[PDB]
Design a protein around this nucleic acid. Structure first.
Lengths: 155, 80, 123, 148, 71, 205, 82, 129
RNA sequence: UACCCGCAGAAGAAGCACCGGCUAACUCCGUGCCAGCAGCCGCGGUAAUACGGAGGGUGCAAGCGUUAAUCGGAAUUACUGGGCGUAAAGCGCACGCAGGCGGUUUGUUAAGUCAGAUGUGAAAUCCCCGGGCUCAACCUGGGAACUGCAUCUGAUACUGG
RNA sequence: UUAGCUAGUAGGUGGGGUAACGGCUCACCUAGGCGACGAUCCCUAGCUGGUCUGAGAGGAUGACCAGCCACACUGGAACU
């Protein structure tokens, strides 16, 4: 039932006496379709070993986001290295309109209706990093009520 | 129904006229800062009772000269 | 940065400079062939590329590519030019429209004919 | 009625016969000046009317393609005919002329007589024979290369 | 397709211009800008300023030619 | 304006039966159904994310006989409409007259049904409708007109129809050759190996 | 003077008129003062086809507005309908 | 110089909070005291006091939960360099209502929620979540 | 004229670009740093899915491509929504007029700000629910919207006097 | 990479003038009036409803429809 998505595969290279050593990298996300999302990143000489190492990482290192009927609480900004990220809770019917890197994160997360956009570097590893943290710092109508010490209508 | 303006006297030199400045704050259309704007009006002062620096209440009336379409209603504060 | 600063000097978008000024926002332009010659291209390529110098109806004089294999063009040939640079030919920023005005179509083309001014062969 | 003359096509706007400014109908006998054609046709040729103009558009453009193909053909031959990068002797000095005559019949006819006076020593050639009057691109044509 | 109006006439390297470029004077008539053929450059084959060489000339531009035969 | 070429090619490229022939035959006895058309059909497409989205949209289009322009306009309308866009797209397709004519069994194929429509053999509410994309509404009654009622295509078409699963939202009287579009089909009425959200994704990017 | 008349909108072969009060000199489909009815000559007549705010029409007449031959007819027709 | 003492207040909170400080103290003012009131009433701080008469020092008792600061973010909105005013129907809400905006109205300082319910707009002093 | 009925026969009605990655679509033959391609990277010296032809395929379809042109993606003039140690960017340094900003209390004022009421914000367009042409484009009823301006009357926490 | 501009100029009195207020005009008198919140000078341009694009804020734009203005070969003039 966990949902897992392959976001990007890439070839890097290391140089030695004999020449270049080629390897691969894999960036993935797993999610429970109901408010939990992890991302993983693995390296290996062959692609399958890399796509597999990443899922393994993605399964742990997983976090919770305070969803709201399949959509977000409030607009949110996320940032990590080059990537400035922005997300909005859209009305019902829209679905996920977003770049590939973000769509995969939001899909597996369970965010059903959102407007998203990535600014600056669309480098996938940092875009997803920035989205996860955005969702993670996203606070909930109940916690702000708890924080402020009042269960007014706003609860 | 007495529409009116309030401002201060920047020039009282002219015979039976005065220059009044109306200042107001306005939101900047693009950058949101509140900016001072001034509107200078040539106003009629029969009897020349308005001194420079005075704060005066003025009203709009028919043309009195090429540039005067306002006249004095009364002085509010004077000689700061 | 300051709001105050922008209030004194607004954001001012840069005006895009064109890559085909001789066209003056026209889709093609007409012109007479001034010189018709070949030239060699830039690193790492190597060839004898067909180009022509063309004086346009608006006075501009530019160099234009003559694409395709084979052409029957010479001085005083009246041709039609369109936008489109030739990358390994610096200075060359226009293409000649094969099969318009005095410029003939490419001989014996079967694929991509319309980009080389070639009628559909009876068959 | 749509009329097609040579590679030129178009609808007739008006009809003129000799002194008569307007004629409604014209028979096989009496000649009538035709008007409303797209451009000045050849000095002479076979003219045929058609039912619709749209059907006659492709035909007219087809005749242009052949006339243009032979134009570039005769252009390649004359230049390649010398089989050398220059002239073998000193006759390279030539004179250029620019001609535009009001009537289409003359430009083809007198040019033939204008090529009769040509000699080996000095070569004369016509450039951009016009259908009539004068124009900007014509004066520009004489500006690039010195010509009368 | 590749037309066939190419030629193979010979000549002698005259100038030693920059970037594998030469003045190569055709035994035939004149000399042309002559650039070193890819093949030839790939197989190195330096080319002194005074060698008998083969040229590939496109009628399109007699003014230019490619050096085919190394020496 | 219509795809006129070989049909089983389309099924073969999309990897599924698209019902472009009557169904009298096991499709595998008419073509190599599980292999794409062409020299390199045996080749496998290691297929990009864009690729799967494209092919799914093609699949639906090829089922209903719709070319790109009209189908895009169908998406636009589905989007504008209230409720889930993906489901709205399929409601709009499934409401087409050529389609409904096919589902009541008057035509062996949507292609055949479309010909029935174009050739003035179909009436809606006793009124002649001859444009394929006519949107049919709840309670409408579409019928074979009297003169087209003795066409043998129609009898055969109704026989095959009787052997397909019978659609819920249509009430068909085979004798009268009339039928009633009771209601818009739900999503649950339509095949579940259609991935509308992929088509929705293709048209939002 | 001020007149009450039909400004012809709708499409080619499918006329649809907007009844309007206006300065008679302005173009037919141009500047008007007040819109006061409409007239569909192509209405199926199964439902509506001709609607006039008779209260405002009369008000304008009371102030001297004239009335088209065609609007004068519509008004007699609509007065007959109910 | 010290031209925005409210930003200063926000920041002293933010920094002492980040520094897991039990309390923070600052020169007092009615306007600070009005904001401290809203914070306390909405449960973002424990309590507060002002001490002295001629040079009043205001003191805020901060609040912690899971070895975490109750105050997650605290930012100045309107400011001396750019005043921000909103109408009743334009009042922002923070975190979709989970946080609050402090608004200053003709009827004194209150939350976006309060001002909304009382048909008012005002100067948007800050956001808190 | 729309529209309806009748007659003849599949009969009169399919092209355009693309298939190296970005990008849906691969092979053979020809050529050999040539002829040529090329939006960007970049293809071409003997196995070229990149040139040119072919077969096959992909995408559009009475159009299809190329060129031109605005905005988008471009958070790449950043109000919303960016930056200046080493990447573009702190004036060599200080004083200082105008300007911007300004600690804390009370009273006052009520310009900024906030509230309400009233008028105006043409129609068409956009959007919503309907109606009419066989459908659609198109035409059309009613609404909502015109986020704006102005006058009056209030509120006085914040800014200004 | 334009910082100063202005003699009917700014105002006052009175006569004349217009359908009507008015330096609109004339005489006399006062010496003002504009300007860094951009005057003056230079370049460009009909304005709007709206149009295209953009989630929006914006950006670009002002054919077709409608509203206002201006022009009618060029410069000037008044007559009805």
């Amino acid at each position: 039932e966990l949902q897992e998505k392959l976001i990007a595969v890439n070839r890097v290279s290391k140089t030695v006496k004999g020449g270049r050593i080629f390897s691969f990298t894999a960036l993935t996300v797993v999610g429970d379709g109901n408010g939990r999302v992890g991302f993983g990143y693995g390296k290996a000489r062959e692609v399958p070993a890399a796509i597999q190492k990443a899922m393994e990482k993605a399964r742990r290192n997983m976090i919770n986001v305070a969803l709201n009927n399949g959509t977000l609480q409030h607009p949110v900004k996320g940032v990590h290295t080059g990537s400035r990220v922005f997300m909005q809770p859209a009305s019902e019917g829209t679905g996920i309109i977003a770049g590939g890197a973000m769509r995969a994160v939001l899909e597996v997360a369970g965010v059903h209706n959102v407007l998203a956009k990535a600014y600056g570097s669309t480098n996938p590893i940092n875009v997803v990093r920035a989205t996860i943290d955005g969702l993670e710092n996203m606070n909930s109508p109940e916690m702000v009520a708890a924080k402020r010490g009042k269960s007014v209508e706003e609860i | 129904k007495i529409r009116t303006l309030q401002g201060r006297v920047v020039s009282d030199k002219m015979e039976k006229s005065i220059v009044v400045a109306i200042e107001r704050f306005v939101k900047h259309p693009i950058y949101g800062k509140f900016i001072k704007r001034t509107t200078k009006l040539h106003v009629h002062d029969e009897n020349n009772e308005c001194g420079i620096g005075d704060v005066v209440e003025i009203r709009e009336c028919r043309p009195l000269s090429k540039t005067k379409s306002w006249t004095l209603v009364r002085v509010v504060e004077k000689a700061v | 940065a300051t709001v105050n600063q922008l209030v004194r000097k607004p954001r001012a978008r840069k005006v895009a400079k064109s890559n085909v000024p001789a066209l003056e926002a026209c889709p093609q332009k007409r012109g007479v062939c001034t010189r018709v010659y070949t030239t060699t291209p830039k690193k790492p390529n190597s060839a004898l590329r067909k180009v022509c110098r063309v004086r346009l109806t608006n006075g501009f004089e530019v160099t234009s590519y003559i694409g395709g294999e084979g052409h029957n063009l010479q001085e005083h040939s009246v041709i039609l030019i369109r936008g489109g640079r030739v990358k390994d030919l610096p200075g060359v920023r226009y293409h000649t429209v094969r099969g318009a005005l005095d410029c003939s179509g490419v001989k014996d083309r079967k694929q991509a004919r319309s980009k080389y001014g070639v009628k559909r062969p009876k068959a | 009625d749509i009329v097609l003359c040579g590679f030129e096509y178009g609808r007739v706007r008006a009809m003129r016969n000799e002194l008569g400014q307007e004629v409604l109908e014209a028979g096989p006998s009496i000649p009538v000046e035709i008007l409303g054609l797209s451009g000045v046709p050849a000095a002479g040729d076979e003219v045929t009317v058609v039912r619709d103009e749209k059907k006659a558009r492709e035909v007219a453009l087809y005749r242009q393609g052949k006339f243009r193909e032979v134009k570039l053909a005769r252009q390649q031959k004359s230049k390649l005919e010398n089989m050398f990068a220059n002239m073998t002797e000193g006759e390279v000095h030539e004179v250029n002329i620019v001609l535009k005559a009001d009537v289409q019949g003359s430009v083809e006819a007198i040019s033939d007589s204008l090529l009769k006076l040509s000699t080996d020593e000095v070569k004369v050639k016509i450039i951009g024979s016009g259908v009539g009057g004068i124009t900007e691109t014509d004066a520009t044509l004489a500006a690039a290369s010195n010509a009368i | 397709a590749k037309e066939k109006d190419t030629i193979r006439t010979e000549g002698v390297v005259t100038e030693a211009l920059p970037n594998a470029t030469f003045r190569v004077k055709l035994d035939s008539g004149p000399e042309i800008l002559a650039y070193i053929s890819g093949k030839m450059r790939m197989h190195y084959i330096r080319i002194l300023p005074g060698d008998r060489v083969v040229v590939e000339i496109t009628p399109y531009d007699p003014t230019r030619g490619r050096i085919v035969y190394r020496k | 304006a219509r795809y006129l070429g070989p049909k089983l090619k389309l099924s073969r490229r999309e990897g599924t039966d698209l019902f472009l022939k009557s169904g009298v035959r096991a499709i595998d006895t008419k073509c190599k159904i599980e292999q794409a058309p062409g020299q390199h059909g045996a080749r496998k497409p290691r297929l990009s994310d864009y690729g799967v989205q494209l092919r799914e949209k093609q699949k639906v289009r090829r089922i209903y006989g719709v070319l790109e322009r009209q189908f895009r306009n169908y998406y636009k309308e589905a989007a504008r409409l209230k409720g889930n866009t993906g489901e709205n797209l399929l409601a709009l397709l499934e409401g087409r007259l050529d389609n409904v004519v096919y589902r009541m069994g008057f035509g062996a194929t949507r292609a055949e049904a479309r010909q029935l429509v174009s050739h003035k053999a179909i009436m809606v509410n006793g009124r002649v409708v001859n444009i394929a994309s006519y949107q049919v509404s709840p309670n409408d009654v579409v019928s074979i007109r009297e003169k087209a009622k003795k066409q043998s295509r129609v009898k055969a078409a109704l026989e095959l129809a009787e052997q397909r699963e019978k659609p819920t939202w249509l009430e068909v009287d085979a004798g009268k050759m009339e039928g009633t579009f009771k209601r818009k089909p739900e999503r649950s009425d339509l095949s579940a190996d259609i991935n509308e959200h992929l088509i929705v994704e293709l048209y939002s990017k | 003077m001020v007149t009450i008349r039909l400004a012809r909108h709708g499409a080619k072969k499918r006329p649809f008129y907007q009844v309007v009060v206006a300065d008679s000199r302005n173009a037919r489909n141009g500047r008007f003062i007040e819109r006061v009815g409409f007239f569909n000559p192509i209405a199926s007549e199964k439902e509506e086809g001709t609607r006039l705010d008779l209260d405002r029409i009369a008000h304008w007449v009371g102030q001297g507005a004239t009335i088209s031959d065609r609007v004068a007819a519509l008004i007699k027709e609509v007065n007959k309908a109910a | 110089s010290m031209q925005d003492p409210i930003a200063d207040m926000l920041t002293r909170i933010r920094n002492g909070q980040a520094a897991n400080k039990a309390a923070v103290t600052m020169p007092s003012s009615k306007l600070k005291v009005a904001i401290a009131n809203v914070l306390k009433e909405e449960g973002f701080i424990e309590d507060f006091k002002v001490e002295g008469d001629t040079k009043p020092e205001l003191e805020l008792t901060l609040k912690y939960f899971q070895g975490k600061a109750v105050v997650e973010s605290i930012q100045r909105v309107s400011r001396p360099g750019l005043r921000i005013y909103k109408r009743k129907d334009e009042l922002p809400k923070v975190m979709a209502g989970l946080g609050i905006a402090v608004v200053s109205t003709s009827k004194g300082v209150m939350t976006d929620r309060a001002a909304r319910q009382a048909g008012l707009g005002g100067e948007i002093i800050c956001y808190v979540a």
